[PDB]
Amino acid sequence: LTCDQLPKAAINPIQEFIDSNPLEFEYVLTETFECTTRIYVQPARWSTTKAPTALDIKGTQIMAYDFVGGPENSAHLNECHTGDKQVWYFQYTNLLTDNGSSYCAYRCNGTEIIEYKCASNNNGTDPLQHQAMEVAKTVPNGDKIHYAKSNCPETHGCFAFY
Amino acid sequence: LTCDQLPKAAINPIQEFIDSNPLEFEYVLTETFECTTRIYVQPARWSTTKAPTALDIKGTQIMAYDFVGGPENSAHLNECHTGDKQVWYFQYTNLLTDNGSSYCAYRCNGTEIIEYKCASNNNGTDPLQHQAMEVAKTVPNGDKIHYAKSNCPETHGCFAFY
């Protein structure tokens, strides 16, 4: 299995992601998205793209990406502080169930997987998430994939922020 | 007029704030909330307070506050990185109109105003907002109140983030 042969699942309507807020990452590839919370935001009333935005929040640091749909269930991200573009797909989504929401998304460079984001609001308890992670580990560079929450700072009275 | 005599308006249901996302600050007191975007978030499925959260985002920095209602239309904030508490009120809200949403909120220390946050998603065009700002300037230390967007960094293809 190479990264380009991973499933490219249908991307749910943006409101379903917004209604899943807040999410935490369960499995990631680089260290970047360890101990990170994800927030989806509707487009600004003044946005001329009318692209919604994904926010990745790690303590007091944040990265934001406006994004639009592309071909074959792709998401095309624009990192808001640099203008750099990324192309993302979903392995699966399972949003707004009785046990909350989960998904796994990935970014490829050809046959190699370069980033991986398994997110949930149910502490990783959707069987689909462990299962999708075991599959993504099998593609080239998927050996980097690991648990995102082994060493997170202690809270000071909030739950998705620190 | 002293800060303690400012109106303490009724706080809209949290979903109305969430449906106003994203907001930008129009007038502020300290420099802290210049060029800042505000995002409201529903409580985490795993939160035991079930407090929603306000996020203030200024470039790649973020401060988060879980908050609950208190007496007399107060909001009681818990800053998520420190645990420090703040008590906030609203001068007015005017959310989810045909011209979008606005509000002005403030924090007092007795008769003195110590922070001020006028927010909107309509570029400050609600007549109530200019009007409320002119009133808050009249309370002690309200002379610090100023336009929040005179010198913000340039965008890189997003609209509420930079």
Ligand SMILES: *[C@@H]1O[C@H](CO[C@@H]2O[C@@H](C)[C@@H](O)[C@@H](O)[C@@H]2O)[C@@H](O)[C@H](O)[C@H]1NC(C)=O
């Ligand atoms: C959340 O889950 C933690 C342990 O469950 C882990 O599940 C997978 C993802 C592995 O990374 C492995 O570490 C564990 O089997 C708990 O330690 C933690 O207390 C749980 N939190 C709540 C709120 O239940």
Ligand SMILES: *[C@@H]1O[C@H](CO[C@@H]2O[C@@H](C)[C@@H](O)[C@@H](O)[C@@H]2O)[C@@H](O)[C@H](O)[C@H]1NC(C)=O
């Ligand atoms: C947004 O508004 C800007 C100027 O309007 C300002 O209104 C008050 C709040 C004062 O601070 C004063 O600077 C101005 O009267 C415009 O420069 C800007 O282009 C406007 N943006 C859009 C998208 O219309």
Ligand SMILES: *[C@@H]1O[C@H](CO)[C@@H](O)[C@H](O)[C@H]1NC(C)=O
């Ligand atoms: C895939 O490989 C690396 C990723 O940084 C780079 O050399 C190359 O530009 C990428 N491919 C394309 C078509 O951009």
Ligand SMILES: *[C@@H]1O[C@H](CO)[C@@H](O)[C@H](O)[C@H]1NC(C)=O
């Ligand atoms: C109001 O004034 C300052 C704010 O930092 C401080 O000395 C004092 O603790 C504040 N009042 C109360 C009751 O905390």
Ligand SMILES: [C-]#N
């Ligand atoms: C991108 N979801």
Ligand SMILES: [C-]#N
């Ligand atoms: C606090 N709104």
